[PDB]
Amino acid sequence: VNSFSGYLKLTDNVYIKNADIVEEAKKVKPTVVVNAANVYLKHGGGVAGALNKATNNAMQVESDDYIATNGPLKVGGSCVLSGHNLAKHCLHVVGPNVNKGEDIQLLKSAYENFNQHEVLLAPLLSAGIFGADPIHSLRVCVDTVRTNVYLAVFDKNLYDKLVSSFL
Numbered sequence: 001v002n003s004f005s006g007y008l009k010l011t012d013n014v015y016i017k018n019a020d021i022v023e024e025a026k027k028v029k030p031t032v033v034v035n036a037a038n039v040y041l042k043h044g045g046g047v048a049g050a051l052n053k054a055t056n057n058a059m060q061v062e063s064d065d066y067i068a069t070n071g072p073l074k075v076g077g078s079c080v081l082s083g084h085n086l087a088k089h090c091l092h093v094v095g096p097n098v099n100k101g102e103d104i105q106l107l108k109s110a111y112e113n114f115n116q117h118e119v120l121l122a123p124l125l126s127a128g129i130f131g132a133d134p135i136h137s138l139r140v141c142v143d144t145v146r147t148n149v150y151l152a153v154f155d156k157n158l159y160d161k162l163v164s165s166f167l
């Protein structure tokens, strides 16, 4: 039993809700919140900008120190950093950004990072400003992640769609 409330169950291990991931993280304090990161950990907009803003820019400060020490992530890669006031940990995962021409097949590699964590609160990788089809992203998520994933979808319209077209 865990503290996630109000999710529709899609599979044995994938759950989905219409929620603002920032507000959901602040209320659940999950062990792991996933950020839709880029390789530079520059959290300017989308989910990343919103999560970072909710940390009063502490996520960005920590991220800049990480990059200065380690260099950029790989597309499809991840790193674990602090969750600040939102979660114990933040798993920064780099999905491919279609608006940069990155190979969508890297989306499966990106979701594989979730399997290193028993339970996660997560956005749909490569959705939103990353330009991928959120329905394809949901399919890859379901077919790749084996751990328990609670997907928050900010847009109510999108959500209702994802549910009605799910197989």
Ligand SMILES: O=C(O)C[C@H](NC(=O)c1cc(F)cc2[nH]cnc12)c1ccc(Br)cc1
Pocket: 020, 021, 045, 046, 047, 048, 049, 050, 123, 124, 127, 128, 129, 134, 152, 153, 154, 155, 158
């Ligand atoms: O709806 C989703 O969950 C996926 C994606 N979300 C974002 O891009 C997004 C951006 C942001 F700045 C803050 C956020 N907090 C939660 N998600 C976001 C999206 C896709 C299509 C459309 Br139309 C609208 C949104």
